[PDB]
Design a protein around this ligand. Sequence first.
Ligand SMILES: CN[C@@H]1[C@H](O)[C@H](NC)[C@H]2O[C@@]3(O)C(=O)C[C@@H](C)O[C@H]3O[C@@H]2[C@H]1O
Ligand SMILES: [K+]
Ligand SMILES: [K+]
Ligand SMILES: [K+]
Ligand SMILES: [K+]
Ligand SMILES: [K+]
Ligand SMILES: [K+]
Ligand SMILES: [K+]
Ligand SMILES: [Mg+2]
Ligand SMILES: [Mg+2]
Ligand SMILES: [Mg+2]
Ligand SMILES: [Mg+2]
Ligand SMILES: [Mg+2]
Ligand SMILES: [Mg+2]
Ligand SMILES: [Mg+2]
Ligand SMILES: [Mg+2]
Ligand SMILES: [Mg+2]
Ligand SMILES: [Mg+2]
Lengths: 163, 134, 87, 131, 80, 200
Amino acid sequence: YIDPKHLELEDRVVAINRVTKVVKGGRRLRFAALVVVGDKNGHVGFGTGKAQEVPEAIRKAIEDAKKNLVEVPMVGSTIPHEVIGVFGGGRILMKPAVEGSGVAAGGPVRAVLELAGVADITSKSLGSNTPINVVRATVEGLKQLKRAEEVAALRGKSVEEII
Amino acid sequence: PTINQLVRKPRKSKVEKSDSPALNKGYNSFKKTQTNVNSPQKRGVCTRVGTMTPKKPNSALRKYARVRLSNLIEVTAYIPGIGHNLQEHSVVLLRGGRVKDLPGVRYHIVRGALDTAGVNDRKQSRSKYGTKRP
Amino acid sequence: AVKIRLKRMGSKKSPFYRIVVADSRSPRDGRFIETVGTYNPLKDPAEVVLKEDLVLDWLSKGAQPSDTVRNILSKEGVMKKHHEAKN
Amino acid sequence: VMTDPIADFLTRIRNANMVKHETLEVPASKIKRDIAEILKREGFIRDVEYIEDDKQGVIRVFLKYGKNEERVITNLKRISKPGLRAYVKADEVPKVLNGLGIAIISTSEGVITDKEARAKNIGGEVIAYVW
Amino acid sequence: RNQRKVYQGRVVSDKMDKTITVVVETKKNHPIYGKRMKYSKKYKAHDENNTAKVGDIVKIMETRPLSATKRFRLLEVVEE
Amino acid sequence: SRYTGPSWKVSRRLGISLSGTGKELARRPYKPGQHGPNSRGKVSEYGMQLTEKQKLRHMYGMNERQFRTLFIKASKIKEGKHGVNFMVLLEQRLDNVVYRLGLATTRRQARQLVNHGHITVDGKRVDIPSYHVEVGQVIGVREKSQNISTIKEAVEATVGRPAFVSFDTEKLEGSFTRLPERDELYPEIDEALVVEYYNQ
RNA sequence: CGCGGUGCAUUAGCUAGUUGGUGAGGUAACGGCUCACCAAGGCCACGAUGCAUAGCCGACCUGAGAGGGUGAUCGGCCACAC
RNA sequence: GACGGUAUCUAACCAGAAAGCCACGGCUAACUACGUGCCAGCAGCCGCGGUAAUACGUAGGUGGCAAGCGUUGUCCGGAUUUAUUGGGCGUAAAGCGAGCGCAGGCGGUUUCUUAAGUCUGAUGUGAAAGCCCCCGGCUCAACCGGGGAGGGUCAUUGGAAACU
Ligand SMILES: CN[C@@H]1[C@H](O)[C@H](NC)[C@H]2O[C@@]3(O)C(=O)C[C@@H](C)O[C@H]3O[C@@H]2[C@H]1O
Ligand SMILES: [K+]
Ligand SMILES: [K+]
Ligand SMILES: [K+]
Ligand SMILES: [K+]
Ligand SMILES: [K+]
Ligand SMILES: [K+]
Ligand SMILES: [K+]
Ligand SMILES: [Mg+2]
Ligand SMILES: [Mg+2]
Ligand SMILES: [Mg+2]
Ligand SMILES: [Mg+2]
Ligand SMILES: [Mg+2]
Ligand SMILES: [Mg+2]
Ligand SMILES: [Mg+2]
Ligand SMILES: [Mg+2]
Ligand SMILES: [Mg+2]
Ligand SMILES: [Mg+2]
């Protein structure tokens, strides 16, 4: 668990989807907002908020995202190793990149990575474009990412021996 | 499929087809056959000129010409712009391009080329519609 | 017969030449047997790069330098070496 | 019928690891012993022992789990398959998770990890990936 | 002295006098998928005395054209 | 082609001061056009990346084709951050070297000097504003040109020279002692956005 | 002579100097290259044969790469000259 | 010395002769007025136009690029949309109605051996030009020149023996 407090979190509105519930009189229109809130230092989360008005949906989503913050391993400006994250339709593949290459990624993955604070990475989305699913798939891949120190500790060998 | 299955019957891809077939085929008068030549445009003679009804969503009188191209293929082409000087037996140049509204129009009649006169009073997007700079 | 001659290279109005052993019938810029040197007339003292040993070996085998290549080989002293080798 | 005992061995480890089973057993073969000892010396598995029987012998693998019962072995993958053999030249030897994983490779010098293979500058058949 | 190509193969036809048909039976990797596929090349080799029979493992060395289709000469019969 | 239109309009469109004075931005810091003064909707990520790309190329007064080729060369450089290298090459461009030395007040003025040939590199005339200037090459004014009010006024007015440039007032000769550092370059510009833009 | 590079099986049989032998002749040269005899062999689902398309390549365009497309200019080879 | 008084150099005069094209509803950077009224027309897809149109036409602005700009044509990409790398088949397209089986594909453990596959070294070759890397010449670049590297399911030959 990562406490939102003590972290200077900033948010970005990934998607604002106007959803409809059909009611006897007609259409009941609501706004569903997907938000990604991150620390630019390795912590990031995503939250969903539904409300009659766009600002309120965004605010609800922001609070949810803070609750869901997670930490991403990072070696320099890029991730430790290649990782594929799959959630539902979403399917993302993210690879380390050389320094200065930038963030090669599309749409929602861009927000997740920027907010997380990763500056250089290569990513490809092999699944659907559904923003919620791709964001979920992104965080799944990041949770798969492993630290050299943790791996070295787990396997019982020095990190130098591992590499 | 298994690798042996792929070996026994390899992958085969779909074959694409042109959206503007008439431009893809030339004609050899001597041999009296059609050749396979990709041409950006093609010259034709207006066998008929008139107007057509769009499809259901839209309503207008879209101005069109039935043209026999230099390769003897007969097609229907749209006439962009406002007002034109075309008539049957008028020599025109055709470019690719569908018209969503119309059922069977796959080509456009280039304005400002051959017998097609530029669009009167056109002042924005003059390259298209083939009008000189005033 | 086998020739030692200049294959033209470079750009318009800025010629360069490669001293190449080639069969006489071949095109000037076409098929050639081997490159043995270079020749840049645009330098005030015309600059020549030569594989003197290879050129001498081809001369011994019976290659016939063109006129300009013969002057080049003379200036580099290869021709005198070939003359002495015949002796 | 079993067409790849090696892949069967890897999948037995994968299934046992998924359920966090403490140990597992497999029919013994020379290549399987080589794979097991490589995992032992790379610290993926806790221990390996061998039982001699009348059929082909048995190899018993004690799985390794970290603190909080975290799985040491993230996954295993069979690369070279009977359907399609996979061979890599000395310069083609791959890296599994930039070295955080390993590739078990069979060479003229024996079955070795990718680190060792590219230290000796020899290629071989890429038996498996582990990480 | 330069060497001519010599191949091992199995006889599959000896109904012609002074000649035999051999099969090399190589394997090649499929260009796209890389699996090894069985590939059969067959050669018409001149037999000096019709010694070799059908289904014999024999070696043949390439030679000057001896007939329309002959290009190889029998050397040894290693299996009958 | 060389851009000649108003300078303030371009600077305020980019939202930063190209000249660095801030004079363009100080009054009416709106995007050019009638809709500039009134509030405008937020810009998309593509717009942001495009704006950074435009920032650099308008700073140095270059066309897109030359800009694109220069970026590719920067990529070919093996060591160091790609965006940083691209900005370093933008600096080494001959016009910018004149501007840094202060022989001209503005990059347009430095470019016109180079185009008209009043500048010489290592004592040799060079009329190519695009010319790449290496470290240690000595950029000087043509002897005939040294007595023209414009360049003399620019020299006396320019009071701050970047650390990497070394200049001599009397000789009117300068040169880059070392490649500019990232912080020495314009910080307001974000090279990473430009890198991603051209990644497309 | 080995190997490599198009489609179609809604194209499955093809071959009769054809496959091989013995001679003889012919060629710069091996050779059914040609001819007389002797046999009945040879090719083919690892695609013969037939149909359609096509000069081949170094190279060029694209692509992260695997690959996809192209075969101008330049050079090599080949073929052709109503 | 055809090029040719050609490149080039010097000196005098003048901001004076030398900027267009397309786009601005979303995708997509770029917005307002009139005129128009499912008409005239736009359009690559979604789709605009029925009297208050940022989507048509004009205007004023703005964005892109620039001696070019845009349209069409064709190829690759995006297209994981033939998926070897890199997809699937309960209900979305997709398991033959079922079995017997020739060829083919694949194949249990292990000792020894072989070296076809596999890995590795040396040699020869894979022309030149062109990509790519260094170094030079044209005021820069394009371009040109020099030296390299690469490029083969290559041939010969020497090793290894885990796997096939
Ligand atoms: C019979 N009275 C109805 C009934 O109570 C409906 N709710 C069950 C009620 O529903 C509404 O409240 C609605 O929300 C829908 C609307 C068509 O009618 C409204 O009035 C509806 C009432 O008129
Ligand atoms: K005969
Ligand atoms: K041809
Ligand atoms: K003929
Ligand atoms: K539009
Ligand atoms: K597959
Ligand atoms: K069934
Ligand atoms: K072997
Ligand atoms: Mg939830
Ligand atoms: Mg328009
Ligand atoms: Mg001279
Ligand atoms: Mg230009
Ligand atoms: Mg691709
Ligand atoms: Mg926009
Ligand atoms: Mg309009
Ligand atoms: Mg594809
Ligand atoms: Mg159904
Ligand atoms: Mg179904």
